[PDB]
Design a protein around this ligand. Sequence first.
Ligand SMILES: Nc1nc2c(ncn2[C@@H]2O[C@H](COP(=O)(O)OP(=O)(O)O)[C@@H](O)[C@H]2O)c(=O)[nH]1
Ligand SMILES: [Mg+2]
Ligand SMILES: [Mg+2]
Ligand SMILES: [Mg+2]
Ligand SMILES: [Mg+2]
Ligand SMILES: [Mg+2]
Ligand SMILES: [Mg+2]
Ligand SMILES: [Mg+2]
Ligand SMILES: [Mg+2]
Ligand SMILES: [Mg+2]
Ligand SMILES: [Mg+2]
Ligand SMILES: [Mg+2]
Ligand SMILES: [Mg+2]
Ligand SMILES: [Mg+2]
Ligand SMILES: [Mg+2]
Ligand SMILES: [Mg+2]
Ligand SMILES: [Mg+2]
Ligand SMILES: [Mg+2]
Ligand SMILES: [Mg+2]
Ligand SMILES: [Mg+2]
Ligand SMILES: [Mg+2]
Ligand SMILES: [Mg+2]
Ligand SMILES: [Mg+2]
Ligand SMILES: [Mg+2]
Ligand SMILES: [Mg+2]
Ligand SMILES: [Mg+2]
Ligand SMILES: [Mg+2]
Ligand SMILES: [Mg+2]
Ligand SMILES: [Mg+2]
Ligand SMILES: [Mg+2]
Ligand SMILES: [Mg+2]
Ligand SMILES: [Mg+2]
Ligand SMILES: [Mg+2]
Ligand SMILES: [Mg+2]
Ligand SMILES: [Mg+2]
Ligand SMILES: [Mg+2]
Lengths: 131, 60, 100
Amino acid sequence: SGAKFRISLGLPVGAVINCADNTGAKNLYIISVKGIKGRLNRLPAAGVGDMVMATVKKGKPELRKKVHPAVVIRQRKSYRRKDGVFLYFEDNAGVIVNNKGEMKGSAITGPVAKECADLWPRIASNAGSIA
Amino acid sequence: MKLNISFPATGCQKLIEVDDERKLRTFYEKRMATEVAADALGEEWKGYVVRISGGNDKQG
Amino acid sequence: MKVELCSFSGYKIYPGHGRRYARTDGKVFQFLNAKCESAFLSKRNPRQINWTVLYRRKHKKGQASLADIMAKRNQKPEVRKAQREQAIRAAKEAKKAKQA
RNA sequence: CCUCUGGCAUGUUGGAACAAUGUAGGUAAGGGAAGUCGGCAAGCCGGAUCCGUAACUUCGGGAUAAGGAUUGGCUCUAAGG
RNA sequence: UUGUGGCGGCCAAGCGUUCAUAGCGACGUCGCUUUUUGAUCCUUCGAUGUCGGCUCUUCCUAUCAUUGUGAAGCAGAAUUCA
RNA sequence: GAUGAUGUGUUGUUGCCAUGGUAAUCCUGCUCAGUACGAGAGGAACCGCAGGUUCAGACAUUUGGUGUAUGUGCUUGGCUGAGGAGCCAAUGGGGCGAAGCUACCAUCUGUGGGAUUAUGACUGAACGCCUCUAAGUCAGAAUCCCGCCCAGGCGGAACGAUA
RNA sequence: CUGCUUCUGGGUCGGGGUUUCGUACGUAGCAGAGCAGCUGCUGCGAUCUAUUGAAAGUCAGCCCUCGACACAAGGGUUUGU
RNA sequence: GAAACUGCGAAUGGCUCAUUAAAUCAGUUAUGGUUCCUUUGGUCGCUCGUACUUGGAUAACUGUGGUAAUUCUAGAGCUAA
RNA sequence: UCGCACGCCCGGCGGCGACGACCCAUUCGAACGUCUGCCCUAUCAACUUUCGAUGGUAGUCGCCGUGCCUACCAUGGUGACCACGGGUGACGGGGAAUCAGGGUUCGAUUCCGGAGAGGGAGCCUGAGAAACGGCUACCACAUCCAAGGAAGGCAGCAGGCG
Ligand SMILES: Nc1nc2c(ncn2[C@@H]2O[C@H](COP(=O)(O)OP(=O)(O)O)[C@@H](O)[C@H]2O)c(=O)[nH]1
Ligand SMILES: [Mg+2]
Ligand SMILES: [Mg+2]
Ligand SMILES: [Mg+2]
Ligand SMILES: [Mg+2]
Ligand SMILES: [Mg+2]
Ligand SMILES: [Mg+2]
Ligand SMILES: [Mg+2]
Ligand SMILES: [Mg+2]
Ligand SMILES: [Mg+2]
Ligand SMILES: [Mg+2]
Ligand SMILES: [Mg+2]
Ligand SMILES: [Mg+2]
Ligand SMILES: [Mg+2]
Ligand SMILES: [Mg+2]
Ligand SMILES: [Mg+2]
Ligand SMILES: [Mg+2]
Ligand SMILES: [Mg+2]
Ligand SMILES: [Mg+2]
Ligand SMILES: [Mg+2]
Ligand SMILES: [Mg+2]
Ligand SMILES: [Mg+2]
Ligand SMILES: [Mg+2]
Ligand SMILES: [Mg+2]
Ligand SMILES: [Mg+2]
Ligand SMILES: [Mg+2]
Ligand SMILES: [Mg+2]
Ligand SMILES: [Mg+2]
Ligand SMILES: [Mg+2]
Ligand SMILES: [Mg+2]
Ligand SMILES: [Mg+2]
Ligand SMILES: [Mg+2]
Ligand SMILES: [Mg+2]
Ligand SMILES: [Mg+2]
Ligand SMILES: [Mg+2]
Ligand SMILES: [Mg+2]
């Protein structure tokens, strides 16, 4: 019901982030974000909770050379929650997620922020600790 | 939030429930097993000083 | 509002201020300001830095019904030794019957 | 780079301001060439000591290949005539 | 100037299971445009700086989307024509 | 963009609006609703609600940048006999940094009317009936114009003080 | 855009408030790897502990002062219905 | 005599043969280089300094419960070795 | 500390036991030690070392001996008699098949020893465990859920997929 508030985005096109799930993929190179119109000379950027499109740059052989939709899990750009805290994470992170929301993985390493765990309810169930 | 009150001087007990917090910050931000005065609780609670002795969380 | 405490220094973080850090292993660390944040990410012990709180606590600067129970309880000991005497009236006569 | 002997008055003018645009220095969160014809420019590495060093080859090289660790101050000890 | 390029009409053989014209449209035919290339050489040879890209404003409509609408071989969803 | 000019007797305060400019945009999620429609498969809308993209205007509490308060510590080479206190090295270097600037990299805000276009209709002839049109009449829109907002005319007004 | 004698006003200095950095010099210490000179003592010794959230800066465009100190009834040029 | 505290067992047994090439394992000797519940047999007034029975907790149990859920257990109250 | 029969001196002596114990035996052993013994490969000929390799001294630790570890010294140890490395579709052995005499092949398999409970690691109690029909982590897999959490380990007997 309640939609997702605006948080500061700090992952433009061309960022490799940690593929933190149990597929075997270890990188996610962001190729484009889903939902971005953008203006002239504007990199489509993503933040926490923004389901994105990525390519695995390092990992298993059968997960590379192919575009996977993904979902950003952690960023280290300090985004602002509405209750007044500037949270940020240690590293950037993401899991591999099909178009319906369900993960290709089965487990998620480390924390998932609440801004993604509320928006993607099946990433939240595989999450060890939230925010 | 339920409160299991107990009289150890003869050894009986029963359970009450209250659902407002300006009656309940007399308990909050303490340790376990400190002495708090229950005189800020209500109409029948005058002269009663009490031990909070710990209890179960929302998940038990 | 929850008025939390800074992880490096240990002052009292108010709701608008501060900054929140979350590592890859849980461990959500609060910070009052970037003076504390830089000194935490540089991995500095607070116990060696003179302005915090964990320094100053280290260096110690600053500062049968009850009626019957009570009825037998309050009983006077000459009545008790007389009761001991009719216990003797049982026992020594019974032991004369033991040998007899 | 700093100083002593020696030399000089800032290189054909001064004063008051610290706007734009420059020229010359710098610094930047998150991302890291997505900019652009092109990593242009900037940046990264950098000395020394102890390790370690591949393919290839005219056997000489490559080679400081690459990749690591240490480096301050103070107090000693040992060895070198 | 408009061959050529682009765009749009008219007439109706036929396509559209049926049915010319929902959407198309043969043979023919009438036009518009200067975002193509030709044609000409009037202007410029006592020099109007000759490709692209970046930046930036403004304009056209021959509309891709958005607002309101009319039409379908429009049930809804999608999509075509206006 | 910045002074200023004419006269209004000179000056000052408070204003008016002639005129120019003009601005907001599009989308997603909840609900409607697995409902209308449909054999199914699928599958919307109107009013509401919560947010977002692009845009415009700001602003500094908070977060981030900057940082020569050359503010405070640490520190290399040298120099003042040494300490202390300091200086030079075209800002020596590096932490941390107040104020001020500043960032969708933080935060706030972004409007209402009128005649109408296309179109759908009303009464109603032409043309006994019919007809949205001929006379008359209604609804009508990201358009147009005005509002809101920016500037304020060789354009005015009210009011004070007038050596 | 402001201020410039109602015993009032601004201005300088001082004081507090705020804040930044991080605990001053001196002194003391049977704290200090150790070393040296005298027979347990005295000197050298980076650093540490106490004094000490100390010291230092803080409006030049920060906040209150009612403490001190002087200043402030002026100068010049034009304007008439 | 249910329940519960205490003692004991749960390191045997059963399965499989992944690892391991002087390792395992096999014959051989050593432990004068070590431990060893148990079972049996020795020692068990050898010491020269309230004992007619010393103490206070705890379980079962009564009672009040919490958790969505576990062979989760919380506060209270009695009581033995 | 506990139980059964119960007597004798004029309160004190007493019976049969049961349990529990320091230490020495004994038993079940375990544990490192000594000698000798194993398939294939040289398209593995030098390996081992300040990252203990082989020794000496003194300690730590252990239940003990021991470079097992630490400090200081010595420069050693193994190898053409195959060291070292690699392979094993290799647990070793008692044994099994075939067989004149020799052999060659097999031995996961019920007896003995060892190793291991998905893979490594670490520990509690206990005399005995680096136990897994114990616990704690991480890795891999995987069950319930109100999304806050919980619990698990068939190479034990059946049984299921693969
Ligand atoms: N409003 C309403 N809906 C109903 C009723 N009974 C069934 N439904 C709805 O019918 C829909 C389809 O029903 P379902 O049993 O799933 O379909 P089925 O299995 O083919 O019968 C569901 O969304 C139900 O909620 C009713 O009595 N009233
Ligand atoms: Mg571009
Ligand atoms: Mg100069
Ligand atoms: Mg000069
Ligand atoms: Mg940067
Ligand atoms: Mg950075
Ligand atoms: Mg490009
Ligand atoms: Mg490019
Ligand atoms: Mg270059
Ligand atoms: Mg090279
Ligand atoms: Mg036909
Ligand atoms: Mg010509
Ligand atoms: Mg020109
Ligand atoms: Mg048109
Ligand atoms: Mg206007
Ligand atoms: Mg249905
Ligand atoms: Mg139906
Ligand atoms: Mg700020
Ligand atoms: Mg800063
Ligand atoms: Mg700042
Ligand atoms: Mg000095
Ligand atoms: Mg120079
Ligand atoms: Mg900085
Ligand atoms: Mg209207
Ligand atoms: Mg009309
Ligand atoms: Mg109308
Ligand atoms: Mg093997
Ligand atoms: Mg094997
Ligand atoms: Mg065997
Ligand atoms: Mg086998
Ligand atoms: Mg085992
Ligand atoms: Mg298994
Ligand atoms: Mg185990
Ligand atoms: Mg089992
Ligand atoms: Mg077992
Ligand atoms: Mg069996």
